[PDB]
């Protein structure tokens, strides 16, 4: 920026004007725009070299928003740390960026890249006989690391529990650690003979992710992000089958574990004898030399109370030196104590699988030193238009609260108004009309409701079953089987239990009457249930996702706060002010003011052996 006259509108852009630079003669071909200050990258997806840049930008820069036409990525320290590991240097990155960038790279951007791209590849964490050794191929690194306050071909032991501390210290210091597993030369760990049967198929994006993971040929450790229903189970099975080493899978549910195992056996040639399921019901482990242990975070992170059989299982897990760990729904590992399992459990390779790499607190960044960087991400609309996933007409219904309940809304405290604006009659009436219309349309409907009282009230009012925490496994399985294969039943009322990690090929329509506040991750996880509909490829099909919200309430605040991730992905919600033909339905719930008053009062009122014979 030298001898560049500002424009009269330059004031409106506070240090954001980028007109001080000139455009290259080949702008018509170069598709990239680079932000010299915020690090945001604008990608033209409708110009030559767009495909060549779409993957490199994903590798070096995190995606902010990727709508239909113009893609938006961003370069950050974590993204550069992830990129520098897979055979990528500043020289190559700058060469490609200059060849694809309409504008020259600024010296500030060059300095920022150089500062962070030259501090990797000097330390390696290895494990030998259940002992963690921080081996470094160079000795001169000692003169600074051992002299640092925290730390302390040469190898020294380190406490297993102190891994979570040493890794974060390594992030703070110049050199971060990389976890590479050369399973080809790893002979100490017994091998497991399981391979993918011919019936298996790998989708193009799955193959691309596997290529990005195994490009160099040595298995690294990290995180994989794919949309719900994309085939994360098959990705994990492929990773296990290609590594061919002892593996432990951690899943945050029991039904999820059951289907995990069922798909595991179906997709690969794993013998039943070599398979073990570690749940609350049965705790037996495979007696073969090598096998797989599928358990849950509750069964791996508990340290105070353990059964006798579960104590033997925990002793087995700790004594044996595992070779691979697969963390399903890894967004919960940075919790207060779930992060402790990473440090305590011994394993040479850690893979995390999650459709969302965000969480409410700031601990999301801790994943970098807990399990590693993110490897691959996949777009939603791209797969929707390519036929890999379904298309959804997301809609937001505005249900006006009636005056009788609103007058109490004004006076009631924060805790009571929550139930008040969730149990408004208008929502009941709209739900009944929509249920009748969609049942005539022959759609399989799921109604989610976090609130157990609201779920029970709706179920008892509509004569339909409800499922929540108190429901037993057998009963809920019976409900699912009948809702699937029985022609009489077409709609069910699920709850927070079935929010994630459940495969419902038949489910097509999704409705939300009660939501768990502003939880953006739960929004996407709930949407994931209907993304694998059986009839998701027939011409003209469009799944439906309804979100009922009361206007002029904080429910609108939370609703607009919980969809900021779907909007970023590309999904757009359509506001439905009115549903046509609602009055013609014969009967509507809570249609009379007398019943409205009765419900108002009800909801407001809601808040010596011989002396043994004596006794």
């Amino acid at each position: 920026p030298a001898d560049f006259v500002p424009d009269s509108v330059s004031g409106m852009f506070r240090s954001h004007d980028f007109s001080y630079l000139r455009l290259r003669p080949d702008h018509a071909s170069r598709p990239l725009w680079i932000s010299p200050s915020d690090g945001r990258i604008i990608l033209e997806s409708f110009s030559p070299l767009a495909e060549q840049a779409q993957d490199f930008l994903v590798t070096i820069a995190e995606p902010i928003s990727r709508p239909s036409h113009i893609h938006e990525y961003k370069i950050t320290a974590y993204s550069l740390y992830a990129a520098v590991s897979v055979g990528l240097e500043t020289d190559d990155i700058i060469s490609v960026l200059d060849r694809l960038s309409k504008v020259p790279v600024a010296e500030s951007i060059i300095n920022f890249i150089k500062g962070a791209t030259i501090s990797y590849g000097k330390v390696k964490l290895v494990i030998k006989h259940n002992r963690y050794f921080v081996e470094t191929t160079q000795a001169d690194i000692l003169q600074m690391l051992l002299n640092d306050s925290v730390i302390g071909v040469h190898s020294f032991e380190i406490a297993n529990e102190s891994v979570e501390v040493v890794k974060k210290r390594c992030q703070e210091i110049d050199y971060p650690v990389l976890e590479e597993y050369d399973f080809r030369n790893d002979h100490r760990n017994p091998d497991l003979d399981i391979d993918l049967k011919p019936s298996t198929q790998i989708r193009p994006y799955q193959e691309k992710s596997l290529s990005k993971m195994f490009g160099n040929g040595r298995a690294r450790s990290g995180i994989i992000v794919l949309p719900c229903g994309a085939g994360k189970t098959l990705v994990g099975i492929t990773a296990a089958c290609t590594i061919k080493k002892s593996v432990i899978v951690l899943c945050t549910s029991s039904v999820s574990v059951m289907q995990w195992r069922q798909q595991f056996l179906q997709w690969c040639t794993l013998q039943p004898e070599n398979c073990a399921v570690f749940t609350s019901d049965n705790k037996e482990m495979f007696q073969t030399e090598s096998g797989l242990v599928v358990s849950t975070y509750s069964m791996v992170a508990n340290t105070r109370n353990r059964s006798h059989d579960s104590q033997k299982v925990m002793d087995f897990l700790t004594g044996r030196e595992w070779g691979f760990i697969i963390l399903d729904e890894v967004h919960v590992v940075p919790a207060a104590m779930f992060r402790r399992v990473v440090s305590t459990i011994a394993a040479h390779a850690k893979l995390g699988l999650t459709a969302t790499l965000v969480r409410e607190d700031d601990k999301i960044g801790d994943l970098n030193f807990l399990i590693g960087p993110k490897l691959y991400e996949a777009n939603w609309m791209e797969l929707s238009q390519k036929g890999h996933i379904a298309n959804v007409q997301c809609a937001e219904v505005w249900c006006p609260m009636t005056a009788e309940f609103y007058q109490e809304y004004l006076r009631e405290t924060a805790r009571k108004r929550m139930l008040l604006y969730i149990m408004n009659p208008t929502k009941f009436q709209a739900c009944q009309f929509l249920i009748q219309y969609h049942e005539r349309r022959g759609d399989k409907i799921i109604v989610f409701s976090d609130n157990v009282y609201a779920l029970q009230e709706y179920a008892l009012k509509m004569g339909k079953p409800f499922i929540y925490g108190s429901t037993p496994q057998q009963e809920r399985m019976n409900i699912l089987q009948n809702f699937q294969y029985n022609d009489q039943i077409n709609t069910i009322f699920l709850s927070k239990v079935g929010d994630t990690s459940i495969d419902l090929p038949e489910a097509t329509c999704l409705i939300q009457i009660s939501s768990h506040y502003g939880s953006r991750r739960q929004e996407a996880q709930r949407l994931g249930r209907i993304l694998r509909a059986k009839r998701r490829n027939d011409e003209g099909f469009n799944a439906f996702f309804y979100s009922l919200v009361s206007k002029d309430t904080q429910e609108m605040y939370y609703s607009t706060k919980r969809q900021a991730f779907l909007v970023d992905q590309g999904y757009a919600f359509k506001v439905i002010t009115h549903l046509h033909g609602m009055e013609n339905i014969p009967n509507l719930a809570y249609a009379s003011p007398r019943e409205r008053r009765e419900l108002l009062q009800e909801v407001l009122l809601k808040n010596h052996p011989l002396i043994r014979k004596m006794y």
Binding site: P400, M401, T402, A403, Y406, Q407, L410, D552, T553, Q554, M556, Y557, Y558, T560, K561, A564
Partner: protein
């Protein structure tokens, strides 16, 4: 035969209830209640109630950044 200067506020039951709460805390706000959708208010307080009602409603609206 009697005329009274004032401002007529036409709205829906919800806005009417909000105005009723505001008047209950400040009696001078609403001069009279005409119907479940109409209220007579003081001319001077119109410019203040509009701004204060916008501030109050800002809570129900999520404005990032």
């Amino acid at each position: 035969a009697r005329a009274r200067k004032g401002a007529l506020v036409q709205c829906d039951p919800s806005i009417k209830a909000l105005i009723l709460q505001i008047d209950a805390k400040m009696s001078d706000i609403v001069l009279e209640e005409l119907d479940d959708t109409h209220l007579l208010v003081n001319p001077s307080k119109v410019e203040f109630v509009k701004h204060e009602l916008n501030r109050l409603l800002s809570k129900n609206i999520y404005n990032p950044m």
